[PDB]
Amino acid sequence: TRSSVLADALNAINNAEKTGKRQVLIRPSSKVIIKFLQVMQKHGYIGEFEYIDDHRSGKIVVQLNGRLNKCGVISPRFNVKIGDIEKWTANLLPARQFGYVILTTSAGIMDHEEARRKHVSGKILGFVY
Amino acid sequence: GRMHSAGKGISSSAIPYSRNAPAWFKLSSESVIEQIVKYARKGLTPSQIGVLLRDAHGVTQARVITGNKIMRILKSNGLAPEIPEDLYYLIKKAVSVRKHLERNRKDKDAKFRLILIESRIHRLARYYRTVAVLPPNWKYESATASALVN
Amino acid sequence: AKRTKKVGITGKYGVRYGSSLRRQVKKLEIQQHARYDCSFCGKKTVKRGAAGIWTCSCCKKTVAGGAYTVSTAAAATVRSTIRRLREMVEA
Amino acid sequence: MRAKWRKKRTRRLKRKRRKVRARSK
Amino acid sequence: GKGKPRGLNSARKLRVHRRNNRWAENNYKKRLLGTAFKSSPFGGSSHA
Amino acid sequence: VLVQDLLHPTAASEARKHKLKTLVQGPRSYFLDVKCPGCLNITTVFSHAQTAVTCESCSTILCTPTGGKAKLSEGTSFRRK
Amino acid sequence: STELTVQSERAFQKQPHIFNNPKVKTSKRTKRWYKNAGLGFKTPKTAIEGSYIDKKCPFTGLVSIRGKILTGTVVSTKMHRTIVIRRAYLHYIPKYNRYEKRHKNVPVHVSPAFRVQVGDIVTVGQCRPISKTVRFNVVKVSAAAGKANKQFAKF
Amino acid sequence: SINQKLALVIKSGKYTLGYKSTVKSLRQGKSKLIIIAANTPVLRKSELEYYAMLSKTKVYYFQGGNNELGTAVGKLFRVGVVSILEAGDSDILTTLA
RNA sequence: AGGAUAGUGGCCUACCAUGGUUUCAACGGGUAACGGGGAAUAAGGGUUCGAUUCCGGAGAGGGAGCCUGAGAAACGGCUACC
RNA sequence: AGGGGAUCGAAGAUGAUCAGAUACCGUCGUAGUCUUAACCAUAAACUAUGCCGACUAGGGAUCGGGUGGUGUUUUUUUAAUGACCCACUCGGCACCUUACGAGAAAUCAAAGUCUUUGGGUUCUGGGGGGAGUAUGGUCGCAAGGCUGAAACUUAAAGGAAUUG
């Protein structure tokens, strides 16, 4: 059965990006998903996306700009100490100058650089580069 | 899907986006409620009531026309059943199959289906006992099962 | 508590006569001493008097049956066959 | 030698082993 | 996927599985069985 | 096609596909106003009636349940609403 | 508490060194010692006006509460004035970066000032050794619903 | 289809279970239908039929014994005959069967 | 409830109840097991070792008992047995 | 264990063949094959591909259900209703082409979305033998099933393809 709507969303976005499509449909598109897309859209990896209101948890259409190499979840959402973020970034990102590891902290969903700026930590959601 | 099968059918109702009553609907909510209670007095299950309301009347959705669902209306009017509808029909099916097995002790397909129906009964009863719809230590004992459905 | 693992009613025979003979006897004595449904009054009160005689404790009706069971499979088959022959003869 | 015949001859040997050990016991 | 439990609360299963599967290793089995102490001409020594 | 309007599909494309797989799922059934000659009452019947429906006045059968849409009786008029 | 045959033993039960003088009489006709245990735990009114003695009660007995304050779920109420609680917790295994469910059973003395059922959530306070295994006394029953009041039967 | 009609009578109306109260209601002319189990003894069912003919009462022969007639009336004991004294919103009386 | 103890405590005794642990591994068995600080190796994660320079425990051929003394069930104290 | 027992046919008996030939081939023929009531619980029990979920490619058939056509066809030739045709759709057994992808390859539409390594979960393996053996336990009437070592030995065994 469905166990992670975030994982489904990011796998769908990866498959669309690899096939070269410039749009992708996401269902059921929760609000953790909306926050993750807002982080990707802030850093420019996706374009505009619009939420489609059915009365059954919704859908999202995402415009892709071709800049995405790989977005994915880390399941389970491991707890990360403030000093282990560097271990996660070293394992998951292709370089040190670009790419983000997305955390869920009590201060909100954010990328690892913003987490370092606010000196917060939490659980790991996924990555984008 | 298909908890006890390999089937993968997606057949189901697709209720409309609109949560308001249809513009062509004229009957009052209290008229729909009194029709529901008449059907319940006749011994009709909530699903049968919904079917008759949808077909003979114009009641697209009881929750839409009224503010409440059919079982909620029945429980407010005191017509709640001793056990819930779906568990009732599962127990009745198990009673039918075991009655058949008594006459047909070599129907191993029937024995297999009986095991599946029993396990479905126990799972749904576990849920109902968890949400306190059924009293605690309610049990399907399969020997006085016909007592629970008459 | 469970007093015997497998001998059941044949525990009266101790260790003699052989386990296979005791098992055959166990099957037929369980059948022979069971209580059976009355086809007339509907109660579970039919017991064997002597081989082939089955009497209901209430309604006092006696039926001829099998040596160790109320009805044998042969007798049931014969009852069905006789019913079928009767039906075609009468129709 | 064929595997099922390894199995068969081994089974016969296990019968003989059981027989001699039951004799001892 | 991948045939192993990834749950954050599956540490006991992962640990017990590793413990069970280490017995297929030659050196781990010899060490945990005390093979040199039991059946080795040298009782685990270099010379005799 | 690598580029398409998932947000604004053509009405034909949405009508050609399954009710659960449109952009927003919705029913394809409807309700009918049905009138019988031997009376003047109008009865509302579901398109997929699933039960033989009679009018409130007299016990004349208006529909017969089938596997899909319910067949309407030979001598009856109806108006899609 | 107030009821249930306080003097049902071979020995007379009384709180030590609290004397009721038959020379002068008052309204209550009996002196009962009690106190609040501290740490914000309220002495129950059943303890306040009960008749039990229970020298091991943290509110009317001779024991005091100090050390660790634990919480648990009642899993057995079959001993006399003693229960066992279950404390569930998650133990970290660093190699796998994961957790495993773990539990301990803690035998706890319960005052007759309390009424506890299997499944209730209780908070227990550490005291001096009470028996061979018991080191904790019930000091408050944190069952606002107890996950049983609305789930058990209703006649 | 008689089991649900009978069960709705048991829920909503008034009935008597048993030979003695059935015959009593038959003489008092209160019964409107009697259901007789299949394994009812023939003398008893003939006498119930005579009583019903004198009282102009409907007779229905249950296709089953007293065990499952008792089951059909929501009971844990055997019932040989059921008499309906006044059916509620059931159609068991107006229905021929 | 009492006895004993420096004191709590089935520590022991009398009476009473039938309890307590366990697949979240009890209980039993093995350890070529004293525990730890630590050691070796190691991108990261790990693996193996730790009798042994410090800390804690235990013992003084094997058991048991005890005097003295604040402190010992001591052994470069005593008593008995092997 | 009872019934049945035509056929075929372990064992066995025979005729050939053969150096031998209680093998293949021929003629018979017991158990068995069938059935009722109990056991057994194993197969290359195979798709040698666990189950649930999501997404990713072109195509035409087919089975079951449903929707539409002012389509054909049947007694009367839209006027008492199936079969067929066309276009969709859900579900299924599959198939063809190609692999963008995967793989050691054979190949694969999953065996893809896997060093750009994490959707959930169960079970199994750790060079070849010894060995599914010994022993203990347990189930079975038995045959045997399930669980299951060690000593010792050894440099390959094995997979898929290429040329001969």
Side-chain angles (χ1 to χ4, degrees):
Chain A
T1 45
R2 267 179 213 262
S3 187
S4 185
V5 299
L6 189 62
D8 280 17
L10 299 192
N11 179 260
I13 292 179
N14 290 318
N15 290 26
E17 182 65 26
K18 283 173 290 182
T19 61
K21 295 183 174 67
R22 314 209 70 200
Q23 68 279 320
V24 64
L25 185 53
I26 305 296
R27 180 182 73 85
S29 81
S30 82
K31 91 196 164 159
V32 177
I33 284 160
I34 292 171
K35 279 279 172 57
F36 200 108
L37 281 71
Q38 273 166 315
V39 176
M40 321 172 81
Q41 184 180 66
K42 182 174 72 175
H43 297 303
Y45 283 101
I46 64 164
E48 193 188 329
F49 62 95
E50 183 178 1
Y51 170 80
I52 309 157
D53 181 40
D54 53 31
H55 286 142
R56 304 167 184 80
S57 66
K59 303 163 162 190
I60 294 175
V61 174
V62 178
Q63 309 300 153
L64 314 176
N65 44 33
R67 289 169 184 173
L68 196 51
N69 297 263
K70 182 70 178 293
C71 65
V73 297
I74 296 293
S75 185
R77 318 191 159 158
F78 297 95
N79 310 304
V80 193
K81 296 302 211 248
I82 192 69
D84 280 358
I85 282 152
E86 61 86 19
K87 302 276 215 163
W88 275 110
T89 58
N91 286 355
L92 300 175
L93 303 176
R96 291 170 63 84
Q97 294 88 14
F98 67 104
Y100 302 94
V101 165
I102 314 299
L103 308 167
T104 176
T105 75
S106 46
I109 311 296
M110 56 183 81
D111 62 270
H112 76 274
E113 288 196 74
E114 182 186 0
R116 181 193 63 242
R117 280 200 307 277
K118 292 181 181 179
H119 199 71
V120 299
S121 189
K123 282 170 203 286
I124 179 157
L125 284 176
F127 54 88
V128 55
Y129 52 81
Chain B
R2 288 315 89 65
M3 197 171 78
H4 289 148
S5 180
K8 299 295 203 270
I10 68 165
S11 191
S12 84
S13 311
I15 69 156
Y17 177 84
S18 162
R19 291 174 179 172
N20 303 282
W24 50 258
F25 194 69
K26 302 300 187 275
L27 318 178
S28 51
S29 158
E30 295 77 3
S31 177
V32 185
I33 284 161
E34 61 86 20
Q35 175 70 242
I36 289 166
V37 306
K38 289 197 323 286
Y39 279 146
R41 302 263 200 270
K42 287 193 286 185
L44 281 197
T45 74
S47 47
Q48 292 184 261
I49 291 160
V51 164
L52 289 200
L53 285 183
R54 179 198 63 221
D55 305 320
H57 315 97
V59 182
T60 75
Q61 297 294 321
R63 151 80 168 101
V64 160
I65 302 311
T66 81
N68 303 118
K69 285 146 62 151
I70 290 180
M71 182 179 72
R72 201 156 266 174
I73 297 156
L74 291 195
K75 176 165 162 261
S76 69
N77 286 88
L79 304 150
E82 65 183 1
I83 71 189
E85 199 198 317
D86 52 3
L87 179 64
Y88 172 77
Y89 276 104
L90 274 175
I91 297 160
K92 189 183 84 170
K93 185 179 286 321
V95 161
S96 297
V97 179
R98 190 183 289 281
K99 179 186 176 61
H100 165 91
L101 267 187
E102 291 330 300
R103 299 179 277 112
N104 307 77
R105 282 82 65 193
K106 269 172 303 214
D107 199 350
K108 289 185 201 138
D109 194 326
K111 185 190 186 163
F112 178 76
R113 304 289 151 174
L114 182 62
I115 305 162
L116 273 64
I117 293 146
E118 310 287 21
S119 58
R120 204 176 304 127
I121 285 172
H122 293 303
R123 281 165 76 150
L124 180 61
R126 184 172 331 112
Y127 159 64
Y128 277 144
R129 273 184 319 246
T130 301
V131 290
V133 173
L134 282 180
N137 71 19
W138 188 97
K139 187 171 285 179
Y140 180 90
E141 58 273 356
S142 177
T144 57
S146 183
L148 309 172
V149 296
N150 308 132
Chain C
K2 183 62 67 65
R3 300 182 293 241
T4 67
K5 184 171 73 175
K6 48 187 76 161
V7 302
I9 193 174
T10 45
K12 60 161 146 182
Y13 296 128
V15 308
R16 38 199 184 274
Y17 319 123
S19 59
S20 281
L21 297 196
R22 279 188 280 107
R23 275 200 312 287
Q24 295 179 34
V25 163
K26 178 178 180 190
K27 181 182 172 66
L28 288 158
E29 273 156 15
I30 284 165
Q31 267 172 40
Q32 154 186 3
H33 296 124
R35 295 177 69 120
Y36 292 83
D37 272 22
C38 194
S39 65
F40 309 98
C41 73
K43 310 200 173 147
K44 193 47 148 52
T45 48
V46 168
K47 294 183 74 68
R48 206 197 82 169
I53 294 94
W54 300 85
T55 313
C56 189
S57 179
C58 51
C59 80
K60 300 295 184 177
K61 286 185 84 71
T62 293
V63 57
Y68 308 115
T69 51
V70 165
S71 313
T72 61
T77 297
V78 168
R79 200 157 45 241
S80 296
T81 289
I82 294 314
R83 188 270 299 164
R84 203 178 70 256
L85 297 205
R86 185 180 67 189
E87 294 294 328
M88 66 181 180
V89 168
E90 292 171 331
Chain D
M1 181 180 38
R2 191 189 184 172
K4 96 192 300 194
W5 304 145
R6 297 293 296 163
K7 192 195 209 183
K8 188 177 183 70
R9 67 186 295 163
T10 317
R11 263 165 200 213
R12 300 292 179 90
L13 184 59
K14 279 162 70 55
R15 303 224 202 176
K16 302 260 265 193
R17 269 187 201 120
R18 284 203 304 268
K19 183 175 174 66
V20 72
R21 194 177 180 180
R23 158 164 194 140
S24 186
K25 174 181 276 186
Chain E
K2 272 203 172 177
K4 66 185 103 173
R6 289 175 184 166
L8 204 68
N9 290 349
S10 64
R12 165 176 297 110
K13 184 97 164 209
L14 289 175
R15 194 173 86 259
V16 168
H17 194 242
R18 184 52 55 228
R19 204 170 67 225
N20 289 333
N21 281 283
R22 284 198 81 179
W23 285 104
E25 307 179 82
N26 290 318
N27 297 154
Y28 179 88
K29 193 167 240 197
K30 273 191 186 176
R31 201 172 74 239
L32 268 295
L33 280 193
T35 301
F37 189 87
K38 297 292 183 291
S39 76
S40 185
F42 303 175
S45 64
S46 46
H47 304 83
Chain F
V1 305
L2 263 48
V3 179
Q4 60 178 357
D5 212 340
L6 290 184
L7 288 169
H8 300 288
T10 67
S13 79
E14 291 290 28
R16 290 176 64 250
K17 71 200 295 185
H18 192 264
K19 63 179 201 190
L20 261 51
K21 292 180 183 293
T22 59
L23 191 44
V24 179
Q25 77 185 76
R28 260 80 170 277
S29 58
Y30 44 92
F31 292 85
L32 291 163
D33 288 329
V34 170
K35 61 181 75 66
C36 182
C39 185
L40 74 164
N41 290 318
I42 301 299
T43 300
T44 296
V45 302
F46 197 41
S47 59
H48 299 85
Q50 155 178 340
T51 187
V53 166
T54 53
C55 65
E56 316 90 355
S57 65
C58 69
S59 179
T60 181
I61 301 299
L62 293 176
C63 73
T64 73
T66 62
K69 275 167 177 187
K71 182 175 174 66
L72 294 179
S73 295
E74 197 47 44
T76 187
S77 174
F78 68 89
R79 188 269 299 164
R80 161 79 162 257
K81 72 177 72 177
Chain G
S1 180
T2 292
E3 58 91 21
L4 201 76
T5 181
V6 297
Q7 300 298 352
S8 86
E9 294 179 355
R10 279 179 197 286
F12 189 71
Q13 284 70 238
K14 67 198 185 93
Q15 303 188 52
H17 296 89
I18 62 170
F19 182 75
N20 48 352
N21 206 331
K23 190 189 279 291
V24 289
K25 295 286 99 176
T26 176
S27 51
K28 63 206 63 59
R29 274 181 292 166
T30 180
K31 269 180 70 67
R32 185 179 183 73
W33 182 90
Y34 63 87
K35 188 175 173 66
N36 61 35
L39 298 179
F41 286 108
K42 66 182 290 294
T43 180
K45 181 262 290 181
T46 45
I48 289 294
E49 65 183 2
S51 61
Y52 71 92
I53 298 302
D54 198 73
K55 80 194 195 172
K56 293 171 182 177
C57 171
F59 305 127
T60 61
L62 278 298
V63 310
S64 72
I65 298 291
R66 75 289 185 278
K68 300 274 175 67
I69 315 295
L70 309 188
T71 304
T73 311
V74 182
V75 287
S76 172
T77 45
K78 288 178 99 62
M79 311 202 266
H80 183 51
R81 293 196 181 166
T82 313
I83 65 169
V84 182
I85 65 169
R86 182 184 176 97
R87 312 195 60 229
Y89 59 98
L90 281 185
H91 176 247
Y92 185 64
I93 312 296
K95 175 184 201 197
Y96 299 106
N97 316 107
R98 278 164 179 90
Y99 302 83
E100 67 189 26
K101 274 183 179 167
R102 281 202 191 177
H103 87 270
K104 297 268 164 61
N105 277 6
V106 177
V108 173
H109 177 86
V110 58
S111 181
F114 294 112
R115 174 78 290 171
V116 297
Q117 317 266 296
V118 177
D120 302 346
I121 299 320
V122 298
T123 183
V124 301
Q126 179 180 344
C127 62
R128 64 155 213 275
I130 284 305
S131 68
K132 169 181 200 282
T133 72
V134 170
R135 282 95 177 91
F136 291 93
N137 221 324
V138 172
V139 291
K140 198 258 184 170
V141 179
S142 299
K147 212 177 282 290
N149 284 288
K150 302 144 169 81
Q151 298 202 338
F152 262 103
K154 301 207 192 317
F155 308 129
Chain H
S1 180
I2 193 66
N3 281 342
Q4 295 79 24
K5 294 181 180 67
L6 196 47
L8 174 60
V9 174
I10 300 299
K11 299 212 150 75
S12 43
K14 279 73 176 176
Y15 59 94
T16 57
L17 312 160
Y19 168 74
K20 263 171 102 172
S21 46
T22 294
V23 166
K24 178 170 178 172
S25 77
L26 279 181
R27 66 190 73 109
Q28 315 193 119
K30 282 159 181 202
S31 197
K32 295 180 176 67
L33 173 68
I34 62 169
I35 300 106
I36 306 173
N39 70 327
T40 294
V42 183
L43 188 50
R44 181 161 275 161
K45 68 182 289 292
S46 290
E47 156 181 48
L48 285 172
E49 286 169 357
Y50 207 81
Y51 271 107
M53 160 201 81
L54 273 70
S55 50
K56 296 183 290 294
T57 311
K58 299 291 180 68
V59 184
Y60 184 61
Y61 299 104
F62 200 62
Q63 291 301 109
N66 50 0
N67 273 290
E68 68 275 16
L69 188 44
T71 312
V73 288
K75 298 297 177 179
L76 291 181
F77 48 87
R78 281 168 296 260
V79 307
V81 58
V82 178
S83 85
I84 309 305
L85 306 185
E86 61 189 314
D89 45 348
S90 300
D91 71 22
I92 191 167
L93 278 183
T94 183
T95 307
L96 181 61

